[PDB]
Amino acid sequence: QFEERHLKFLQQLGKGNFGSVEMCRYDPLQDNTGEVVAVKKLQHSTEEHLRDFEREIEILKSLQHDNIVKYKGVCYSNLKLIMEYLPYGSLRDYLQKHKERIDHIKLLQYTSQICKGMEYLGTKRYIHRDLATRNILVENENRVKIGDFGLTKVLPQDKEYYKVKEPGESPIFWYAPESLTESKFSVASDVWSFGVVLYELFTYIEKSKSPPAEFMRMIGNGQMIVFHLIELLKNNGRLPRPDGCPDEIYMIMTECWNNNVNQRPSFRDLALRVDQIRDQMAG
Ligand SMILES: O=C(Nc1nc2cccc(-c3ccc(CN4CCS(=O)(=O)CC4)cc3)n2n1)C1CC1
C-alpha cells in the first residue's frame, strides 16, 4: 500500500540492537496532508533477523484488538513495517512524566487493558516474551496498547510451551525462572512478566526502583548475573512491594511470581481480580 518515496522521516522513536522505530509522514500527494505513522525497520539486517521480522509482521497483521497497536502496511525498496502513530508514546516515559497526575485507579485501568490484550494473544496461541512498560504505548489518557511484537512466538499445536535461546541480550529481569534456566516460554511466563509490568507501574518508573536496579542490588552490583539471578528466584527472592502499593495489588504481583509455573493465575482471572479491585476503589 505504501511507497518508499512518499515516506518522510520526522524523528527517531527508539533504537535497539536489532530494530528501530521512526516517526514518518506518509505524504503521497506531497502537499503535507498525509498522516503521521510509525515505521519499524531492522537496524542491522541479517537474513535470519529478516525472516523473524517477516513473521513479526504477520503476527501484528493478524491481531485486531483495542489494546494492540494497529498494523497499517509494509513498505520496501528493504522491509519496513508501517503502524499507527501513538502520540503519547511508551507507558514507561508517560508514567515517568505524568506521575503526579496518574493515580492508582488509573494504573489498574491500564493494567486491565494490558490483561485483555494479553488474553487476546493467548487466544491465538501467541507468546509475547517481551512484556514491559517500554513496549506498551499510550493512545490517550484512558487507553493503552501493546506496541511491539519482535520477540512474539506462536506455540506449536502439540505443546503449551516454546523453547528458544536467541543470541545477545535478553530482558532477564522480566523473565520467569524456567525461561532463564530452560528457555521455556508459555502463557505462564508471560504472566510472570505481567507481574513485573505491574511492579513497574506501581513504582511510577522511579529510576532506582526498576527491576534491573533492584535485582542487581539483591545480587550484588557479566555472565555470572543470570546465574545469581536464577539462585535468588529459586530461594523466593523477589522485587519489594513498591512505595504506596496496596497489599492486595502486591498479592497479585507475588501470585504472578510463582516458581510453580502451573500455579500462576490466567490472564482472565487477573482481569477479574483487577476489575474487582477497581470497583472497590470507586464504588
Ligand atoms: O513513541 C511515540 N509514538 C509511537 N508510536 C508507535 C507505534 C508503534 C510502535 C512504537 C514504538 C514501540 C516501541 C518502541 C521501543 N523500542 C524501539 C526499538 S525496536 O527494537 O524497534 C522496538 C522497541 C518505540 C516505539 N510507537 N511509538 C511517541 C512518544 C514519541
Domains of the chain: 1-85 (3.30.200.20), 86-279 (1.10.510.10)
Going by C-alpha positions, the residue among 146, 175, 137 that lies closest to residue 59 is 146
Distance in Å, CA 137 to ligand 1 centroid? 8
The 3 state secondary structure assigned to 59-101 is HHHHCCCCCECCEEEEECCCCEEEEECCCCCEHHHHHHHCCCC
- Cα(129)–Cα(267) distance, rounded to whole angstroms? 15
- Cα(156)–Cα(16) distance, rounded to whole angstroms? 28
- Cα(229)–Cα(186) distance, rounded to whole angstroms? 20
The 3 state secondary structure assigned to 205-249 is CCHHHCHHHHHHHHHCCCCHHHHHHHHHHHCCCCCCCCCCCCHHH
Note if 130 is an active site residue: yes
Q: Whose CA is nearest to atom 16 of ligand 1?
A: 14
- Cα(78)–Cα(87) distance, rounded to whole angstroms? 26
Tell me if 170 is assigned to a ligand binding site: no
Q: Which residues contact 190 (CB under 8 A, 6 or more apart)?
A: 118, 121, 122, 127, 128, 129, 131, 267
Q: Whose CA is nearest to atom 2 of ligand 1?
A: 89
Distance in Å, CA 280 to ligand 1 centroid? 34
Cell 482481569 appears where? 271
> What are the cell numbers at 166?
536467541
Contact criterion met (CB below 8 Å) for 230 and 177: yes
Question: For the residues of 4-15, what is the DSSP string, one character each?
Answer: GGGEEEEEEEEE
Q: Which of 52, 130, 148, 190 is catalytic?
A: 130
CB atoms within 10 A of CB 250: 18
**Ligand 1, from 20, 90, 97, 174: best to mutate by most atoms within 8 Å of Cβ?**
90
Query: CB within 6 Å of ligand 1 — which residues?
Result: 13-16, 19-21, 38, 40, 69, 83, 85-86, 89, 134-135, 137, 147-148, 150
- Cα(104)–Cα(109) distance, rounded to whole angstroms? 9
Going by C-alpha positions, the residue among 87, 89, 85, 90 that lies closest to residue 39 is 85
Contact criterion met (CB below 8 Å) for 122 and 190: yes
Q: Which residues contact 143 (CB under 8 A, 6 or more apart)?
A: 66, 67, 113
Going by C-alpha positions, the residue among 256, 257, 70 that lies closest to residue 149 is 70
Distance in Å, CA 39 to ligand 1 centroid? 9
